[PDB]
Amino acid sequence: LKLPTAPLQLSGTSAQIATLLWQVAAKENQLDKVQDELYQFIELFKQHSELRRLATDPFVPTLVRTKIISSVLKDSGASEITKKLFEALADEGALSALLEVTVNYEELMLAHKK
Template sequence: MALTGRIRSGLPFFRYLLRSEATLSRRSIADRSFPSPNLAGSEGLRCFATKTKETEANIKIPLSLFGGTGNYASALFLAAAKANQLDKVESEILDVVEASKRSPLFSSFIKDLSIPRETRVKAVSEIFSEAGFTDVCKNFLIVLAENGRLKYLERIAQRFVDLTMAHRGEVKVIVTSVIPLPEQEEKELKQTLQDILGAGKTVKLEQKIDPRILGGLVIEFDQKVFDMSIKTRAKQMEEFLRQPLHFG
């Protein structure tokens, strides 16, 4: 059953907490004393790290991420890797993000810091135990609830996926065009990109449609942008034509 369905059917307790006027009307003192967004040394992350028992000696984070969301994503990667559950945890964390998009109730819950910390923690523990999540993912979500960082879940999940893709040697390539690429053109483009990236890398192509580029392609990967759109070419031509002429 999809996580959204499990949330909807599994916990009347959760709905009761969110609908309670008393719960929604007060903000806990702890909520106002959360650590700053740079959370590398926070108590929450240290507690989360202790929930996995193996050492980190042979585990390396494939990308250097910075900021609070990067710290959380890196901590989750280490815990999932040590538990040999990277794929499972990735699937679970993306399920939670999807549930937050589909369920207004759940979305409201993760964004509302007026809900006291102990209420958030209890609800998260109940929900994801009921949903059968791994201890790694469940404990991580509890840490986010404790620190009032559930509202950053989508961004943390995106950065976690960046890490898992890098770990698998996958490179996400976003191709923007006016219409979907024909199958043969997509295949040829993917092969060209594969040749550029070289052995040991796997191209993961994502197509986006944007009529505003007028035609051509915009290709993005590895923080590089190759803009071959008609819109950009037309702008470049316009700038060229506006330059003053110099006669010898």
């Protein structure tokens, strides 16, 4: 529609998530907010094995994946972009992409702070 343009163009389907994640967090001026919120999940995937089961194990049902991510992120004051982000990835099973969205969210944040 009318979104702020990304600081630099990027690759496909994993940086296009991070470009769109940057493009909506800029209209909210929460660029430094969700970059902190993405980093907290990367340590969270380092801690719990029952959480990175929802991103690698192909036998969890796609209902149980999208319910657990919602049932955890009802609270804590996480930004409403990221709790909409993680429900988009949990419906599609693209929770593995978060490690590659974050490294593509970084250089968008780096070229915004120049």
